[PDB]
Amino acid sequence: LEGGALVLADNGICCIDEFDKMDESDRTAIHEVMEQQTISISKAGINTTLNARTSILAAANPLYGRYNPRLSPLDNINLPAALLSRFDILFLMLDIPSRDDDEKLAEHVTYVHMHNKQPDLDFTPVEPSKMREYIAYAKTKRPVMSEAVNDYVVQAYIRLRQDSKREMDSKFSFGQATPRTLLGIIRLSQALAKLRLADMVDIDDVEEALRLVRVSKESLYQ
Amino acid sequence: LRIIWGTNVSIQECTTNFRNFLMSFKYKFRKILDERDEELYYIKQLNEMRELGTSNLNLDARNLLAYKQTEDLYHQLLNYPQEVISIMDQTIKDCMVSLIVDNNLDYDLDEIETKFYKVRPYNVGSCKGMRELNPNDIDKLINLKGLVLRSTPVIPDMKVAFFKCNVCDHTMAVEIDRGVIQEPARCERIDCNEPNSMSLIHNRCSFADKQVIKLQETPDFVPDGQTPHSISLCVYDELVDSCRAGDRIEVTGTFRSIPIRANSRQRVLKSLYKTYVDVVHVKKVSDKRLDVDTSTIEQELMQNKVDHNEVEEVRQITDQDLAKIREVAAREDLYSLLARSIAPSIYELEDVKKGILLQLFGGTNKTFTKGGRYRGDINILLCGDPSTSKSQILQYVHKITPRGVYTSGKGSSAVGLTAYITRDVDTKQLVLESGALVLSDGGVCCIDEFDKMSDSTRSVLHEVMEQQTISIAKAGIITTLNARSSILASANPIGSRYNPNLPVTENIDLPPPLLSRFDLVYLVLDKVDEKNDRELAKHLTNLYLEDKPEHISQDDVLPVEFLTMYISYAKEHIHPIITEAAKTELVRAYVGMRKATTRQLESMIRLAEAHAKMKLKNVVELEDVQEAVRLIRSAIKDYAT
Ligand SMILES: [Zn+2]
Numbered sequence: 116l117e118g119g120a121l122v123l124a125d126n127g128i129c130c131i132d133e134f135d136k137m138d139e140s141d142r143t144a145i146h147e148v149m150e151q152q153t154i155s156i157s158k159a160g161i162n163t164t165l166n167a168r169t170s171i172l173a174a175a176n177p178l179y180g181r182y183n184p185r186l187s188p189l190d191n192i193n194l195p196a197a198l199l200s201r202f203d204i205l206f207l208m209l210d211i212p213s214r215d216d217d218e219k220l221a222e223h224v225t226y227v228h229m230h231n232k233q234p235d236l237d238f239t240p241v242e243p244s245k246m247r248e249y250i251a252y253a254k255t256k257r258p259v260m261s262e263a264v265n266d267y268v269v270q271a272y273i274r275l276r277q278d279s280k281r282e283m284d285s286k287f288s289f290g291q292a293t294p295r296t297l298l299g300i301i302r303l304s305q306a307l308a309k310l311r312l313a314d315m316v317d318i319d320d321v322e323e324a325l326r327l328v329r330v331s332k333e334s335l336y337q
Numbered sequence: 338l339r340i341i342w343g344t345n346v347s348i349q350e351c352t353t354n355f356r357n358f359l360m361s362f363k364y365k366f367r368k369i370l371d372e373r374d375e376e377l378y379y380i381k382q383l384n385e386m387r388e389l390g391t392s393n394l395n396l397d398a399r400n401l402l403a404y405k406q407t408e409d410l411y412h413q414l415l416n417y418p419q420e421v422i423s424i425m426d427q428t429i430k431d432c433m434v435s436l437i438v439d440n441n442l443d444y445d446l447d448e449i450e451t452k453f454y455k456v457r458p459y460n461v462g463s464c465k466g467m468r469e470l471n472p473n474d475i476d477k478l479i480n481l482k483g484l485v486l487r488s489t490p491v492i493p494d495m496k497v498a499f500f501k502c503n504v505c506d507h508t509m510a511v512e513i514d515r516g517v518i519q520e521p522a523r524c525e526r527i528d529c530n531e532p533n534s535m536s537l538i539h540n541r542c543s544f545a546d547k548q549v550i551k552l553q554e555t556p557d558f559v560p561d562g563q564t565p566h567s568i569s570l571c572v573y574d575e576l577v578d579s580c581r582a583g584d585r586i587e588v589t590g591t592f593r594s595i596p597i598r599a600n601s602r603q604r605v606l607k608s609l610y611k612t613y614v615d616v617v618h619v620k621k622v623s624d625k626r627l628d629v630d631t632s633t634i635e636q637e638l639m640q641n642k643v644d645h646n647e648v649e650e651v652r653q654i655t656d657q658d659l660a661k662i663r664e665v666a667a668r669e670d671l672y673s674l675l676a677r678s679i680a681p682s683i684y685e686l687e688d689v690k691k692g693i694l695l696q697l698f699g700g701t702n703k704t705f706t707k708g709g710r711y712r713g714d715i716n717i718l719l720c721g722d723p724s725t726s727k728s729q730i731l732q733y734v735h736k737i738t739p740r741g742v743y744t745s746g747k748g749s750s751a752v753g754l755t756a757y758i759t760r761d762v763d764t765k766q767l768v769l770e771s772g773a774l775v776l777s778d779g780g781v782c783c784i785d786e787f788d789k790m791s792d793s794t795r796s797v798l799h800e801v802m803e804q805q806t807i808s809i810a811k812a813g814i815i816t817t818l819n820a821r822s823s824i825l826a827s828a829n830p831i832g833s834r835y836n837p838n839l840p841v842t843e844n845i846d847l848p849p850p851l852l853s854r855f856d857l858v859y860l861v862l863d864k865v866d867e868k869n870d871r872e873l874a875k876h877l878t879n880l881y882l883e884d885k886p887e888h889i890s891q892d893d894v895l896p897v898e899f900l901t902m903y904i905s906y907a908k909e910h911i912h913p914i915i916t917e918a919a920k921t922e923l924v925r926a927y928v929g930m931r932k933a934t935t936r937q938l939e940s941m942i943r944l945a946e947a948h949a950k951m952k953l954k955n956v957v958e959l960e961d962v963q964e965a966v967r968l969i970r971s972a973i974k975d976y977a978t
Contacts, residue, residue: 116564126561143746143789150728155745157773158753162486163553163565164743189834196833200723260881269874273867280865290834291863293724297874301881 116161121148124169134173135193142198145171149201150295182209188289188335196290203299205289206331258308260301260316268304268321272297275325287335300324346413346420352428358404359383359432366403383433391645392453394429395618398461414458418478418591418617422456429454457618459589466556467568470592470612478617482587485580486567487551487770499541505529546574552586569763570614575646578637580619582771583740583778587620621649626739627901628652630779631909632702633821652905662903666953670893675951678895680733682880683726684873688968689859692717693734696823697904698947701913715943716802716824718787718852720845721861722835727827731783734825741781741822742773747790751797756809756818767813774807777822784826788846795851798824802854835862840978842933853933856940859972913949915942918959926966941965 121129121144131137131145147154154165175193177183183191188207192199199205226234233240275292283289300321307320339347359379367373382394401407401414414421433449464470464480498518500509505528511521524531552568570590572579580586594610622628628651631638641647665671676690699713719727735743754774761768774782774797784790801807801820808817831846841860842849852858880886923945927938945961 118564122564123562125563139789140747143786144748146786147745151732153743153745155743155748156753157742157744157749159757160759160770162742162753162770162773162776165565166559166563197723197829199833257884259884260878262882265875265878265882268878269871272874273870276865276870277867280863291865293722294873294877295724297877301878305881 121167121169122165126168129169129171131173133175135175146198187286200293200295203295207335209334211337253309256309256312256314258305258314258316264316264318264321267318271325346417348424351424352431354406354410355425355428356432358407362400362404366399369403390448393455395457395459398458415478425456426454459618459620461589466554475592475594477592479592480589483552483554484585485550485582486553488581489549492547493544494547495542496545497543499538501536501538503534503536546577548572548577550580570616572616578640579648583776585739587623589618590614590616619648622652624898626737627905633779654906674893677893678900681889681894682886684876688972692857695944695947698950700943700946712805712821714823715856715940718855718858719827720830720858722863725861727861728785731785731827734781735783738781740779741777741783743783744773746786749794751793754794754797755807756814758812775818775820778819779821780823782822782824787826787828854936857969857972860974907950907953911950911953911955913946913955913957916957919957919962922959922962926962
């Protein structure tokens, strides 16, 4: 047996594009993959519970191409929250013109096309060989979390839960924060501790996690 | 000095060492291996076995690892299992006769001398699937753990090469030499000298019994990019009708090799040798999960009894543990302690867990004289907001249940559910393969994303949910089989983020009857509020606070082992017959709840029978109806709308 694109990926990464155009079969498979790291098949000789252990990274576009500022994301987007709940993170990257930012946006694009060398900042991005060496080394640890951060995480979870449920049931509201949201926050704080290369978690990381979580959708209000 | 060519094994020295270890072993492992009353661990088996006339015996590896004078025997039985066991087959009888010397007995000696003996090393060193078996380590005692897919017929083998001389009214006898027969072409020169006049007859000869089993390997670790495989093996006589489809197995054997012919025409072989495995023992049960229904397997029980092969089929009990069980059943906090114990790593979900445990209890298994059958199984459905422990609970149930399969979404079809026909890769012949619906025959069937699954596939379950009997009519196959499996699956809500102010019987994207016929359903709506969220948050963060949740044992949580043994004994030993008092509450509860079909009556009775089975009651009583109706109404949350 040789598996499909997901199976050839394991303890690694996967990429997908135009998710809205995929079939309900793909939706059913990825739904099971995202939360549980197995796969079930009952077609033929194959009756396996195959191990995926894969990381999913999809992308798509709205129903109308450009955003609908007069409709909520929960309606403009085509995917259902019944599945999107498993998506611990979600960004809404839409564009509105502005006189100043596009100046240097065009500057950057023109420079990179003039020559592949990225802007000549006093900075040297490094080879993916070294990046993979670093990520492999950081993957060796398995840090721990204290109670001083646990209680703050619980308080923030309660805050977000109540605020989103009672207040965010309106124009710019997407569903509600979930236990999966809490688990993702915890996992990302663990990743931050791994990057710092310490076997303990500091209170200085949950702040970053929640900051990014609530900044993912800042543009929805402009 | 006595030794074997190219070997470091001694016959008489090994015999003496084996006898010394046998005479001297008293739970040495409880002392050396760990800190954990009794005496002479081994000797009891041999003392008791004599009167029952059995030519079998089991054997561990940890005992040799523990005793002082068996460490070297360890590697010698490892490298040369067949030779060491052939030595042991004589050493065991030597010890038997040297132990009878201290006893006077009635004249049973006519049997032991003519008898034989064999061993079965079962709990041995671990092996990492088949990837580890590079050709350096061939022909050695090995262990594995996998499930069963396909079983083949009986292969006879020439064991007594009879021969018929054409003249001189004489027969002839000759035996096999390392797996070949050399027919003596001559004709017993003395009486007659015809150098090539003899014949062959099959009815006279003796035959051996062999099987071949296709197995699916289920390791504990796999490399980056692994996928399932299939292996073939060979069992031999006295082990037939032991392992088949629908059983998880931990096994032992001996990796080997063999070439195959290039045709049925001449002797030209392949430079590559097809591998295989020859069995030494099969372990049919384990500690981390209960066992098969006892009434479901009565015919096989009696068949094995008659065949005098008694490999384990059901776990055995101890009187002290039975008394402990009766003591634990005395207290009244069982009804919530079981729920707290099923999943200590999750928030309460009290009624969900209680229903899961009642399903594991199962219920009632009655039959009529010829035209009835009513099995213990109540189909269960889940539904509610995502981002909860529904999938975790389902995976837990699949792990803990012995006989079940996992199916996901629309990746399934009627052909791959019921029986389907395929071809073998070696014999090149039309051979079948069992379907996932039948593989779980007795136990659990898990589904997720029950909504998007294809309508074609959703059609089949109508009859499974009723008579537990699938039917097949396709190429060369006409038979109706049995699928006593149970159903336990999740469902997703219509649209997304749910709709509070709408009838939920129409808020699922699923037709009425398919949902109504479910025996019981559970609802996982959100209802966000403190006093139910901060507690959960700490409950789940303290899981990670430790490297592994062993501090979770606080708050009165039982161990898995005693719980499972209690469940198995209760399942196998008690049969609560329906009572009279429960009628006047059951009928009224059903009628009042109709204000949505008669299947909920069957659901309620089958769940009240499981409740009566709990507490070890041999009789139903009125209270079970109360709990059943109250829990049904709470599960559907009648008070809301
Ligand atoms: Zn003759």
